[PDB]
Each structure stands twice: as structure tokens, then as C-alpha cells.
Amino acid sequence: KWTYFGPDGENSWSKKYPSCGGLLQSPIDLHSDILQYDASLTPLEFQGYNLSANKQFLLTNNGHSVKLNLPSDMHIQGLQSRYSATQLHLHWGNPNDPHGSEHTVSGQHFAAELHIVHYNSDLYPDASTASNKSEGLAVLAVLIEMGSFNPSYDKIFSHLQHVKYKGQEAFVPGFNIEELLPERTAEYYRYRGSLTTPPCNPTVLWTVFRNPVQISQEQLLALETALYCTHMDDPSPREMINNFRQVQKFDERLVYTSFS
Amino acid sequence: WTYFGPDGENSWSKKYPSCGGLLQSPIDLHSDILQYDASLTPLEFQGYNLSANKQFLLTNNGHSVKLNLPSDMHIQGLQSRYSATQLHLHWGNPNDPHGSEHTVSGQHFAAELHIVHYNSDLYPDASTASNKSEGLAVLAVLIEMGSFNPSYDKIFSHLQHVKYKGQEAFVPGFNIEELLPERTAEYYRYRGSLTTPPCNPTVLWTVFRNPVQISQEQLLALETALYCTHMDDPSPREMINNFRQVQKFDERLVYTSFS
Ligand SMILES: CC(=O)Nc1nnc(S(N)(=O)=O)s1
Numbered sequence: 001k002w003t004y005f006g007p008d009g010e011n012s013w014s015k016k017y018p019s020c021g022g023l024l025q026s027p028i029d030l031h032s033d034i035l036q037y038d039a040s041l042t043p044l045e046f047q048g049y050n051l052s053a054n055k056q057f058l059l060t061n062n063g064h065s066v067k068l069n070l071p072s073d074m075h076i077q078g079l080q081s082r083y084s085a086t087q088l089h090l091h092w093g094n095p096n097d098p099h100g101s102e103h104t105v106s107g108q109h110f111a112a113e114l115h116i117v118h119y120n121s122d123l124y125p126d127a128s129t130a131s132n133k134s135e136g137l138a139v140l141a142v143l144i145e146m147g148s149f150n151p152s153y154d155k156i157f158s159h160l161q162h163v164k165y166k167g168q169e170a171f172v173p174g175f176n177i178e179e180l181l182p183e184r185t186a187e188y189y190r191y192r193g194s195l196t197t198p199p200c201n202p203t204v205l206w207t208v209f210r211n212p213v214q215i216s217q218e219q220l221l222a223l224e225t226a227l228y229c230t231h232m233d234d235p236s237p238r239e240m241i242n243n244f245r246q247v248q249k250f251d252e253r254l255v256y257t258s259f260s
Numbered sequence: 261w262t263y264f265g266p267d268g269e270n271s272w273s274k275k276y277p278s279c280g281g282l283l284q285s286p287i288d289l290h291s292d293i294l295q296y297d298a299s300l301t302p303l304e305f306q307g308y309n310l311s312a313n314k315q316f317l318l319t320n321n322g323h324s325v326k327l328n329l330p331s332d333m334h335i336q337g338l339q340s341r342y343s344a345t346q347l348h349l350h351w352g353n354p355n356d357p358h359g360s361e362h363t364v365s366g367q368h369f370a371a372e373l374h375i376v377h378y379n380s381d382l383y384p385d386a387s388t389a390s391n392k393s394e395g396l397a398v399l400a401v402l403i404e405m406g407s408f409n410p411s412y413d414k415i416f417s418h419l420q421h422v423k424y425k426g427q428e429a430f431v432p433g434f435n436i437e438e439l440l441p442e443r444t445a446e447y448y449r450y451r452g453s454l455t456t457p458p459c460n461p462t463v464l465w466t467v468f469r470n471p472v473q474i475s476q477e478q479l480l481a482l483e484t485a486l487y488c489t490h491m492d493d494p495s496p497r498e499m500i501n502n503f504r505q506v507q508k509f510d511e512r513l514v515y516t517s518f519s
């Protein structure tokens with residue numbers, strides 16, 4: 001068992017999960033000294049992202065975040081291999097410190113961060129098998145900041161009060177996932193990293209979009225207050241907050257950008 | 261332990277339990293956790309003008325370069341008297357010269373100086389005080405690249421003498437107060453820990469608000485003059501990026517002596 005605070009917190013993950021203390025760890029801070037423009041970084045193509053409204057997708061509180069299961073028919077085109085979706089989830093802070101993104105830019109956190117996880121379907125049958133193997137995963141990261149109300153993100157957030165406790169699930173009708181992506185997706189940061197949660201396998205090709213999306217103060221507060229990492233029948237509930245990993249050392253390396 | 265590799269910071273907790281415990285330092289000094297406190301009056305640095313006729317030990321311990329300080333120098337202004345034991349530094353590398361431990365509004369500084377003191381009213385020495393309540397007080401000075409600093413050079417000029425792990429050299433006494441920034445009355449104050457194993461949560465931190473400046477040449481010397489390996493080692497390793505990543509610090513338990 002692992003957590004984001006306490007005895008089983010991130011500084012202790014390496015005890016049970018060796019890779020968490022290994023190489024190519026994520027997340028990292030994106031700042032000028034280690035950024036480099038690469039004109040070869042072309043735009044990714046998002047296929048099958050417009051999920052059928054006649055299909056239902058499982059939303060689950062897994063005790064670490066709120067996740068939405070995604071179908072393998074939606075995928076990313078533009079990488080060396082085809083990567084098919086498996087799930088999306090988020091990371092956030094808390095009402096008193098609403099800056100819980102995992103990746104930071106010039107030392108600055110964003111309010112939250114969305115991760116759309118994909119696995120190499122050309123080499124592996126599923127995300128489980130691909131997770132601990134070479135070039136097994138590709139994650140898209142969307143930085144989130146407080147601003148205007150976001151109807152698209154609310155297609156997920158409107159169900160939060162129904163997955164308040166660990167293990168609980170709800171069904172979300174399909175909608176266009178591309179609606180969760182920011183403007184100018186052609187502009188992004190790219191680097192080889194790891195899962196930001198145990199086992200921390202260094203098998204993730206990260207793509208962090210340059211521009212953030214906005215959600216309202218109310219939407220952000222709901223995300224920061226509606227969930228608990230404990231079961232509903234728990235006499236001592238524990239709020240699911242600050243579920244992001246601290247940035248990791250990033251030395252002798254460069255993060256390449258598709259923008260100058 | 262080291263600052264990189266299997267024995268790196270994410271693995272410190274395997275051998276040193278407190279590194280995975282509470283009140284860990286360093287932290288990001290940002291508005292969300294700050295709180296102005298008028299009770300935080302100016303500290304007085306006594307006995308800091310070390311006799312130029314006396315020599316003080318400079319040592320490369322494989323983790324940093326440290327200078328031993330006499331117990332007669334101490335901080336005045338805190339509840340108990342804290343006597344000095346040593347000072348040392350933390351820095352980054354030439355390609356990414358941002359190796360301070362603490363950050364301000366998410367920003368790292370080029371380097372950071374720590375002047376370590378122990379509670380001499382409660383404990384007999386630094387070693388005994390290290391893992392006990394109210395045992396330590398560290399003064400942190402943020403360092404950025406700028407104009408040449410003659411005072412810091414009183415230390416840097418001796419770096420080649422302690423180039424390798426285990427090496428020692430003598431440094432004539434000078435006024436340590438010269439290493440402090442302007443307006444020392446302005447600082448951040450919080451209860452934290454040692455930033456290296458055993459990471460004991462016994463440190464009262466005082467991070468001065470304003471940074472000092474050292475020249476690009478001084479910073480480069482610091483980033484390239486030392487090795488964490490012994491003299492003539494078959495695989496020499498440069499001493500760089502010897503700082504710990506910032507730790508989560510939830511509650512607004514960081515106080516400032518300024519508004
Ligand atoms: C989806 C899956 O199999 N697990 C993951 N664990 N952490 C992930 S993250 N935060 O790096 O995107 S994805």
C-alpha cells in the first residue's frame with residue numbers, strides 16, 4: 001500500500017517499488033535551461049476520441065485519484081508505434097493550496113493536471129502487460145488552471161458526488177475526449193519518463209501540452225473536496241487531496257519542445 | 261548515501277527513517293503557506309568576527325565543502341542560545357546553475373549557504389543535539405549570480421585545497437557576518453529538518469529573504485572545483501547537484517518577519 005502523505009508517502013515508495021528510486025523519473029520541472037526546440041516534433045493525431053454517447057464508460061474512485069476507463073479503439077497517431085487509450089485521471093492540490101499539477105513550468109504549479117494514458121498496442125495486448133516494458137506507455141498531460149467554466153470537463157465532474165469514496169463507480173456517457181485538450185495541441189513538451197505513481201516504471205513517453213485549459217473556481221473546488229481515499233463505511237474518512245508527486249531531479253538531459 | 265543513484269534521495273528512507281517522516285526540508289517558500297509575524301525580531305550574530313590569527317578547518321566530506329566553526333559564535337534573539345558548529349554549501353551544475361535547496365515562489369537560486377548551530381543551552385554539543393527537541397537552528401543564505409563577492413572568496417579561494425573527498429585545509433578567520441545578505445531582519449521562519457540523512461525533524465530554519473551575489477566565475481569555480489571521489493580515483497565524480505528536492509509542506513506554518 002502507498003499514499004501521498006505519511007509513512008507510506010512518496011519518500012518511502014522506493015522501499016517497496018525499486019523503480020521509484022531509479023532512472024527516468026517523472027514528473028519534472030520544465031524550465032529554459034533544460035528545454036530545446038526540435039522542429040522534427042510533428043502534431044499528434046487523436047483518433048477515435050469522439051466516444052459514442054450511446055456507450056457508457058466506467059468512472060472509478062480507486063483511492064488514489066478518480067479515473068475514467070477508455071476504449072482501446074481511441075488512439076494516438078504520430079508516434080513510432082500506435083498507442084491505444086486505457087484510462088484518464090487527474091492530480092490536484094487542496095482548497096488552501098490549489099496548485100496540484102505534477103509537472104511544473106518555470107517552477108510554477110498549475111491548479112491540476114489531466115493524464116490520458118495509452119499503451120503500445122502494436123507490441124502489447126493491454127496496458128497491464130505494457131506498463132513494465134520498453135516503450136510500453138504514452139501519456140498525454142493537460143495542465144489545468146482556474147478560469148472560465150468548462151462544460152467539457154464537467155461531463156466528468158458532474159459525476160464526482162457519485163464516486164466520493166474508494167471503490168465506488170459511476171457511468172459516464174461517451175463524449176468527445178478531444179474537448180479536454182487545450183488550444184494548439186501541436187505545441188508540447190516531450191521527454192522519456194515514468195509513471196508518477198508506484199511502481200514508477202520508466203516506460204512512459206510523456207507529452208505535456210504547452211497551453212493549459214481552464215475550469216471554474218467551483219469546478220476546481222469540487223475536484224478538491226468531493227473525493228475521499230477511504231471507503232464510505234469508514235469511521236475516520238480521509239480526504240483525497242494533494243495527490244501529486246514532487247518534481248524529480250532532471251540532470252544531463254533535455255526536454256524537447258515542438259515550439260520555439 | 262548520495263544525491264544520485266540507488267542511494268539517491270528517493271532511497272534515503274530505506275536506511276534513514278526520518279527522511280521519510282514528517283517536517284522534512286527544504287520547502288518552497290510561497291504565499292500559500294506564509295504568515296507575517298511581528299514577534300520575529302532581528303537576530304544578533306555574536307562572535308562571528310573570527311580571529312584572523314586563528315585557523316579554521318575546511319573539509320570536503322564527499323557531500324559538500326564545510327568549514328568548522330567555534331562554539332563561541334552564536335545566535336542571539338531566539339528562545340535559547342544556539343552555538344555554531346559548521347557552515348557548508350549546496351549547488352547545481354554549469355548547464356543548469358540553480359542548486360539552492362529552498363525555493364521562493366517556485367524559483368531556485370544558484371546556490372545556498374547553511375550556517376549550522378545547536379542548542380547549547382539544552383545540549384552539550386551538536387552531535388547530541390541533532391536528534392533532540394529544539395536541537396538545531398540553521399541560517400540559510402540564498403545565492404544568485406551577480407557581482408564578485410570578496411567575502412565569499414575568503415572561502416572559495418581555498419577550494420582547490422579540498423578538491424577531493426576527505427581532504428582538509430585551513431582558512432584564516434574572517435567575519436562570517438560578511439556572508440549574510442542585506443536586511444537580515446527580513447527572513448522566513450519555520451520548523452523543519454536536516455536536508456541530508458538522518459533528516460532529523462529538529463531544525464528551526466531561518467531563510468533570509470534577500471539573496472547575496474557571487475560572480476559567474478565564483479559560481480563556476482564552486483560547480484567545477486570539487487569531486488565527491490577520493491584523490492586519483494579511477495572513476496572521478498564531480499560534486500554537483502548536491503541539494504535535496506523541495507518537500508511538500510501543507511499547512512501555513514511558514515512565518516515571515518516582513519509583510
Ligand atoms: C494507467 C496505469 O496503468 N497506471 C498509471 N499509474 N500512474 C500513471 S501516471 N500518473 O503516470 O499517468 S498511469
Ligand SMILES: CC(=O)Nc1nnc(S(N)(=O)=O)s1
Pocket residue numbers: 345346374376398453454455456457
Ligand atoms: C551539521 C551536521 O553535522 N549535519 C548537517 N546535515 N545536514 C545539514 S543541513 N543541510 O540541514 O544544514 S547540517
Ligand SMILES: [Zn+2]
Pocket residue numbers: 089090091115196
Ligand atoms: Zn497521472
Ligand SMILES: [Zn+2]
Pocket residue numbers: 348349350374455
Ligand atoms: Zn545544508
